[PDB]
Write a protein that binds this ligand. Structure first.
Ligand SMILES: *[C@@H]1O[C@H](CO)[C@@H](O[C@@H]2O[C@H](CO)[C@@H](O)[C@H](O)[C@H]2NC(C)=O)[C@H](O)[C@H]1NC(C)=O
Ligand SMILES: CC(=O)N[C@@H]1[C@@H](O)[C@H](O)[C@@H](CO)O[C@H]1O
Ligand SMILES: CC(=O)N[C@@H]1[C@@H](O)[C@H](O)[C@@H](CO)O[C@H]1O
Ligand SMILES: CC(=O)N[C@@H]1[C@@H](O)[C@H](O)[C@@H](CO)O[C@H]1O
Ligand SMILES: CC(=O)N[C@@H]1[C@@H](O)[C@H](O)[C@@H](CO)O[C@H]1O
Ligand SMILES: CC(=O)N[C@@H]1[C@@H](O)[C@H](O)[C@@H](CO)O[C@H]1O
Ligand SMILES: CC(=O)N[C@@H]1[C@@H](O)[C@H](O)[C@@H](CO)O[C@H]1O
Ligand SMILES: CC(=O)N[C@@H]1[C@@H](O)[C@H](O)[C@@H](CO)O[C@H]1O
Ligand SMILES: *[C@@H]1O[C@H](CO)[C@@H](O)[C@H](O)[C@H]1NC(C)=O
Ligand SMILES: *[C@@H]1O[C@H](CO)[C@@H](O)[C@H](O)[C@H]1NC(C)=O
Ligand SMILES: *[C@@H]1O[C@H](CO)[C@@H](O)[C@H](O)[C@H]1NC(C)=O
Ligand SMILES: *[C@@H]1O[C@H](CO)[C@@H](O)[C@H](O)[C@H]1NC(C)=O
Ligand SMILES: *[C@@H]1O[C@H](CO)[C@@H](O)[C@H](O)[C@H]1NC(C)=O
Lengths: 319, 208, 166, 49, 148
């Protein structure tokens, strides 16, 4: 007698349920080809072994991906559908994007991939933040040690605590709280004589029992419309986070972001995507000014009374 | 005289198995840390329900009388342990004022701490443990006996040693069901603001 | 399970009954609910075929040319080793398509051609030539500016209802 | 497409009902198979519960 | 259009649903009953219909808050991707971005993004720097390469 509301609820949950794969597709599937690194590892001294695939497992997730999958966590008509991309097919994507980043750079984003030696990729990267190519080459083993140190600290951080992944464990929690709350609402009375349906059917005659069940239906059907409304709003938050992840994986992984503070603290060099359960994690690699000195300076200098200005950089006096 | 109840008086409030879960429930429970009345004889009110506990080395207490009159005129419950067997009956009994007809129900079959919960028709829950003034600790009173006897009770007596009495009240208890089916901790939610927090969260550990 | 001697019913987290004690013989019986699931009619366009596969979501095939999947039991699609792109999605890595003598086929989808890159500590590829290309992109910008007059919806042509709507 | 169109659902195969196995009956033989009965002036009475 | 049309067509069909009233047409309740009996029956249709509008208007508010996020994306592309040359990778079509041309559409907008894509490539041996007079040399722009 209430009409199409049941179908409209299954249509509303199917809008959400399809979208969860459209999100996971547009975030991860940004590449036409599954790129692979050679067996050789001459990446200029940089030790990507902790973020590349590990062959020792049936699903070849990286060392850092298995920290992320470890740090994060019934039959009343409710059903959980499976994702279209299972977590190995996610990990083949994060393998491809990362392998193409190391043995390509942005060029696999821009079209067909073009190889480059890694210490020439970083030479450009540094040049992309106004730090001239030779600042890599005069410091290359130091830079690879700073990078290897920084990737090491990520593992220790992710090994210590789950508190960093609150951004994902909160999604898993809210979805599981909404499922429990929807099931618990079956045991509520809504002004009827029991929350059990066969009680009402057996203990009363139809002229009375059909009012007691108009009570339970007008309660239950509003219990669903409330859950589905919460899911549609929750899903519109997650849609906007899937599109921010798709935007970062486009600009921040497949390119080099000039957008300040968009791609971690610092000047951006490059970033490495890692999958996570119902999410994604970016390792942003950034150049940060450290030691410094005060100088005297001028906007210009005189010679023959004509004024000289720098092509690149600034004038300084040491004193 | 008086004694602190501590974390005692927790009983299985239903015949339902549950494992590794924090089941919150609101019923006749003993307020935690309240002061039980302490005896080393008298006639007592029953109110809504009684926690009765006795510490013994000597089998001195044998049972109880319950009713509203406790001097015939209407039906009264009697429970008695004697020698080889235990007895239960509900007649309109005459009694002594110092003990130590229409029988609609009848049946016949310190180093000890014995504990009992009596509530209304009438239900018995209990636990028994060795010890060596009521001890600080926790216990899970199991249901023993259900009497469909229809007796009204407002007062009661002991048939004869240290024993303690306190009245159950409609409070919310968060009961921790353990491994292969046992109650093993509880929170009395109205006890203090941390207990109100544990019952807000439905958790025994609270985060910062 | 190990119910205590007085415990008669078992309960789960969400207040589901997970087990019961038999009252005559003291054994504990696990309750599993009767199997149910959505029925999904996997199909090409009727402008191509009247063959349809069916997916019984989350069920051992026994209770229903049959394939068991992580999504449920798939009937009327042939299990094919060849991994193509996705055509009709199914779930849990599976997709299905209508292909050649023609049937529906079901397979783990391929993520596209693989490519070991010719990386070395000395080699660069540089484009000798380019393609300009034009790519369409489409974005929605507005809805139909709908407006529903609540009164003439709920109580259309009746003051005798409107007096109650207030 | 992949249109979801109906729900599969296993039907109950047969009914089961369970209760404790027979014990503790009323003493009917000590009323109906008795060796002694009342005079009609002074009817016996026995409580069954 | 399909989502709006499925939302309107369901909102209309629900006018014909009973909600437990003796008719889903109000003029049948009014013609067959007196007011003391009508207010029990009409309140069913009000309670139902009103739940049917609360539902429809919640969908349109959630939906419009998605179309708003697509309109603000189109306004960001029509700024950076038409009125400029955005260096933001894959934002403005696959390739390197040159320019784009906006075209209207019913309830939308369409971009012709024009992109330079690298196409015919050869392998070269390369080196990060060169020696000539014991001092080390680097390119001002681009890379060193050997033709073989
Ligand atoms: C790259 O660094 C990793 C550690 O982050 C190295 O892997 C470890 O290598 C040591 C020997 O040096 C082994 O004892 C450990 O068991 C390895 N750990 C793991 C998780 O496998 C790796 O050898 C380094 N590779 C290079 C080329 O330096
Ligand atoms: C509930 C109650 O009456 N508690 C009192 C407590 O406040 C008092 O401080 C104590 C003195 O020993 O006796 C008990
Ligand atoms: C001493 C006494 O009062 N005995 C009562 C009797 O008066 C009452 O009529 C009967 C009812 O069954 O129960 C007994
Ligand atoms: C936590 C705990 O004590 N679990 C015990 C288990 O060790 C024992 O083997 C079993 C016997 O049925 O009962 C339960
Ligand atoms: C759980 C239980 O008490 N089961 C008993 C069973 O052992 C006995 O053989 C039967 C006799 O009919 O009665 C019942
Ligand atoms: C998903 C799942 O558990 N499927 C089970 C399978 O593992 C088991 O071997 C079979 C026994 O007939 O029943 C089905
Ligand atoms: C669906 C299908 O054709 N599966 C076959 C499988 O039966 C066979 O054993 C295997 C041999 O490598 O090739 C594949
Ligand atoms: C220098 C060179 O090789 N140029 C070729 C051009 O001749 C050809 O017409 C075009 C096809 O799109 O590709 C490029
Ligand atoms: C226990 O007391 C009852 C009286 O209430 C008496 O009938 C019974 O025989 C006593 N038990 C034994 C074993 O003597
Ligand atoms: C029980 O006792 C109270 C007096 O405290 C009385 O008001 C009440 O009616 C009695 N109820 C029954 C069922 O005997
Ligand atoms: C079926 O598809 C053909 C195109 O191949 C089209 O011309 C025809 O109108 C379609 N008919 C229906 C009923 O969809
Ligand atoms: C004993 O009496 C009962 C009355 O319930 C009757 O069913 C049974 O058949 C009788 N048997 C004999 C031998 O009298
Ligand atoms: C680059 O070298 C690989 C061999 O490692 C070869 O297959 C490929 O065709 C070469 N590319 C070009 C453009 O010559």
């Amino acid at each position: 007698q209430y009409g199409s509301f049941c179908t409209q609820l299954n249509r509303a949950l199917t809008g959400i349920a399809v979208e969860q794969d459209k999100n996971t597709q547009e975030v991860f599937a940004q590449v036409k080809q599954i790129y692979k690194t050679p067996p050789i590892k001459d990446f200029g001294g940089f030790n990507f072994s902790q973020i590349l695939p590990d062959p020792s497992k049936p699903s070849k997730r990286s060392f850092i991906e298995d920290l992320l999958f470890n740090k994060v966590t019934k039959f009343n008509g409710l059903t959980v559908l499976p994702p279209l991309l299972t977590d190995e097919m996610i990990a083949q994507y994060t393998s491809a994007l990362l392998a193409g980043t190391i043995t390509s750079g942005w060029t696999f984003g821009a079209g067909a991939a073009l190889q480059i030696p890694f210490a020439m990729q970083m030479a450009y990267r540094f040049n992309g933040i106004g730090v001239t190519q030779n600042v890599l080459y005069e410091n290359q083993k130091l830079i690879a040690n700073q990078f290897n140190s920084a990737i090491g600290k990520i593992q220790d951080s992710l090994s210590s605590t789950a508190s960093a992944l609150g951004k994902l464990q909160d999604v898993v929690n809210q979805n599981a709280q909404a499922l429990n709350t929807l099931v618990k609402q079956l045991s509520s009375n809504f002004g009827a004589i029991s929350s059990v349906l066969n009680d009402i059917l057996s203990r009363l005659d139809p002229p009375e029992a059909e009012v007691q069940i108009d009570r339970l239906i007008t309660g239950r059907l509003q219990s669903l419309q409330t859950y589905v409304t919460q899911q549609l709003i929750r899903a519109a938050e997650i849609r906007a986070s899937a599109n921010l992840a798709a935007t970062k994986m486009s600009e921040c992984v497949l390119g080099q972001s000039k957008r300040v503070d968009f791609c971690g603290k610092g000047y951006h060099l490059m970033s490495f995507p890692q999958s996570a359960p119902h999410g994604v994690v970016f390792l942003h690699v950034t150049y940060v000014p450290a030691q410094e000195k005060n100088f005297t300076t001028a906007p210009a200098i005189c010679h023959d009374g004509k004024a000289h200005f720098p092509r690149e950089g600034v004038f300084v006096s040491n004193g | 005289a008086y004694t602190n109840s501590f974390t005692r008086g927790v009983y299985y409030p239903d015949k339902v198995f549950r494992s590794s879960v924090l089941h919150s429930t609101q019923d006749l429970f003993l307020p935690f840390f309240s002061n039980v009345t302490w005896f080393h004889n008298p006639v007592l009110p029953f109110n809504d329900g009684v926690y009765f506990a006795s510490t013994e080395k000597s089998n001195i207490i044998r049972g109880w009388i319950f009713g509203t009159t406790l001097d015939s005129k209407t039906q009264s419950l009697l429970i008695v342990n004697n020698a080889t067997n235990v007895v239960i009956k509900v007649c309109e009994f005459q009694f002594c004022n110092d003990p130590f007809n229409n029988c609609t129900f009848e049946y016949v079959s310190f180093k000890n701490l014995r504990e009992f919960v009596f509530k209304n028709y009438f239900k018995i829950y209990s636990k028994h443990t060795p010890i060596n003034d009521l001890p600080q600790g926790f216990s899970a009173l199991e249901p023993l006996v259900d009497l469909p006897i229809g007796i009204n009770i407002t007062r009661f007596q002991t048939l004869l040693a240290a024993y303690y009495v306190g009245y159950l009240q409609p409070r919310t208890f968060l009961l921790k069901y353990n491994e292969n089916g046992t109650i093993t901790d509880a929170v009395d939610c109205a006890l203090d603001p941390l207990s109100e927090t544990k019952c807000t969260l439905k958790s025994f550990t609270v985060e910062k | 399970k190990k119910f205590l001697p007085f415990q008669q019913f078992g309960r789960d987290i969400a207040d589901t009954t997970d087990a019961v004690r038999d009252p005559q013989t003291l054994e504990i019986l696990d309750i599993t609910p009767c199997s149910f699931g959505g029925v999904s009619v996997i199909t090409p366009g009727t402008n191509t075929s009247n063959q349809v596969a069916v997916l019984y979501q989350d069920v051992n095939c026994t209770e229903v040319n049959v394939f068991q999947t992580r999504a449920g039991c798939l009937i009327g699609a042939e299990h094919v080793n060849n991994s193509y792109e996705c055509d009709i999605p199914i779930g849990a890595g599976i997709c299905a398509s209508y292909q050649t003598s023609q049937s529906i086929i079901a397979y783990t989808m391929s993520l596209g051609a693989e490519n070991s890159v010719a990386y070395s500590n000395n080699s660069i590829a540089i484009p000798t030539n380019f393609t300009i290309s034009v790519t369409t992109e489409i974005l929605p910008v507005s809805m139909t500016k709908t407006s529903v007059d609540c009164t003439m919806y709920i109580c259309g042509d009746s003051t005798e209802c409107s007096n109650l709507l207030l | 497409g992949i249109y979801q169109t109906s729900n599969f659902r296993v039907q109950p195969t047969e009914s089961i009902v369970r209760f404790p196995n027979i014990t503790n009956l009323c003493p009917f033989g000590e009323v109906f198979n008795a060796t002694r009965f009342a005079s009609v002036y002074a009817w016996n009475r026995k409580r069954i519960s």
